[PDB]
Amino acid sequence: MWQQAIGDALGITARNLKKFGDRFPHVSDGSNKYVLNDNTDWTDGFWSGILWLCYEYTGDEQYREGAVRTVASFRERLDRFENLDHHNIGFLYSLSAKAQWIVEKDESARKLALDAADVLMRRWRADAGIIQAWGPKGDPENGGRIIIDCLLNLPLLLWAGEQTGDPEYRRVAEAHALKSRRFLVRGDDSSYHTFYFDPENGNAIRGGTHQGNTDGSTWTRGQAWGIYGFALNSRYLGNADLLETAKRMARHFLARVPEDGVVYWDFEVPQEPSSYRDSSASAITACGLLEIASQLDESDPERQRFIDAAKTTVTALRDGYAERDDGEAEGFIRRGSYHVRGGISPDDYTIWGDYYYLEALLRLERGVTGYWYERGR
Numbered sequence: 001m002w003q004q005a006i007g008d009a010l011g012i013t014a015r016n017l018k019k020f021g022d023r024f025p026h027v028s029d030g031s032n033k034y035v036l037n038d039n040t041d042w043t044d045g046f047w048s049g050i051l052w053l054c055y056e057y058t059g060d061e062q063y064r065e066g067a068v069r070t071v072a073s074f075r076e077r078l079d080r081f082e083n084l085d086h087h088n089i090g091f092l093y094s095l096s097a098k099a100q101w102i103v104e105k106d107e108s109a110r111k112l113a114l115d116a117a118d119v120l121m122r123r124w125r126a127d128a129g130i131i132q133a134w135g136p137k138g139d140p141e142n143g144g145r146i147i148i149d150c151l152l153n154l155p156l157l158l159w160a161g162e163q164t165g166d167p168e169y170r171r172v173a174e175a176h177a178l179k180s181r182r183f184l185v186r187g188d189d190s191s192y193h194t195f196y197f198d199p200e201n202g203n204a205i206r207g208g209t210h211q212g213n214t215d216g217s218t219w220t221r222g223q224a225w226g227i228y229g230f231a232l233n234s235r236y237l238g239n240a241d242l243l244e245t246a247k248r249m250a251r252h253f254l255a256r257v258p259e260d261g262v263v264y265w266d267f268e269v270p271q272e273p274s275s276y277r278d279s280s281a282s283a284i285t286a287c288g289l290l291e292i293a294s295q296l297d298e299s300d301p302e303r304q305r306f307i308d309a310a311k312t313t314v315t316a317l318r319d320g321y322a323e324r325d326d327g328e329a330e331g332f333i334r335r336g337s338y339h340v341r342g343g344i345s346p347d348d349y350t351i352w353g354d355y356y357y358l359e360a361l362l363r364l365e366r367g368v369t370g371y372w373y374e375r376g377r
């Protein structure tokens with residue numbers, strides 16, 4: 001039921017690895033070909049994650065060799081501090097360096113991940129009690145802003161905390177997670193994309209977005225980041241409240257899935273066929289659902305209900321958005337959207353979409369849970 005889907009992904013990945021060389025895929029832009037970069041964006045780690053997933057499934061060394069090469073690329077990126085002045089250090093190094101340590105216990109990868117965790121830690125603003133999303137410290141407009149995406153970048157810190165025994169990692173991680181729950185999540189279980197606090201004291205100011213339709217809409221990927229993100233912090237912290245929030249945001253998402261099973265880019269715009277979609281949001285959510293389920297009690301009937309929703313979602317992605325390995329297609333799933341309001345790849349492949357789509361398949365077929373935490377933790 002999942003072998004066929006995985007099969008096409010494996011084939012597409014093998015071809016890409018040869019085609020791309022040492023370059024990294026980000027998103028497509030009006031075609032079945034990925035636009036590449038020299039490891040300079042926030043999405044580069046997803047390529048690494050895909051390669052490590054393919055290796056774990058097949059045992060095929062060509063995948064492992066490609067992943068190892070990206071790790072070397074990440075060491076260079078880190079020791080040069082190239083475009084890392086943001087919170088996405090987690091997405092970047094959890095799926096690359098920490099991934100290798102999770103897969104084969106490579107001490108060298110472990111240290112790199114730890115090195116990367118230290119840099120991310122210096123993004124914490126004591127006065128505001130948050131981890132700054134974008135820009136250098138004190139940035140006039142972003143110095144006190146947090147984003148729901150950041151929840152997915154906390155696993156790197158939490159993992160490092162357990163690795164080093166340094167309590168500060170978990171302290172700042174839990175604090176930021178709770179702050180996010182109070183201000184980014186809304187009363188109807190929906191969510192804001194970003195939230196602003198007073199840099200001087202950390203007082204709440206306002207919620208808002210630059211990727212969602214309006215400050216008060218629900219950017220589906222934002223919601224997705226929340227679902228999976230809160231569930232991941234929930235696991236590390238053993239926080240029943242964060243888990244509850246994950247489930248709330250999940251149920252909200254599920255009740256707004258359109259007919260073909262894959263969501264539009266924002267829940268608060270007309271849910272019409274001519275509107276852009278965001279397959280990546282559905283992909284992230286499928287993983288979120290499985291993570292939540294994995295934390296529930298067996299007697300919890302909602303557990304199987306989430307697993308089934310995750311399956312239905314992956315199946316929906318497979319039947320309507322997945323690319324068959326036709327020798328040309330470079331992406332796993334179509335119709336992802338990067339920045340709709342901005343006009344940037346609103347109907348294309350997204351490397352993160354591809355990663356979560358595969359992680360979902362690996363979770364469902366082999367019980368392989370990705371690289372957010374140690375296997376068996």
Ligand SMILES: CC(=O)N[C@@H]1[C@@H](O[C@@H]2OC(C(=O)O)=C[C@H](O)[C@H]2O)[C@@H](O)[C@@H](CO)O[C@H]1O
Pocket residue numbers: 042086088134147149150211221338339342344
């Ligand atoms: C480093 C940075 O700020 N990059 C911008 C992008 O931000 C990323 O967006 C997403 C996403 O899911 O789309 C996830 C990351 O958490 C976040 O840092 C994004 O805003 C993009 C839109 O055009 O612009 C980049 O500059």
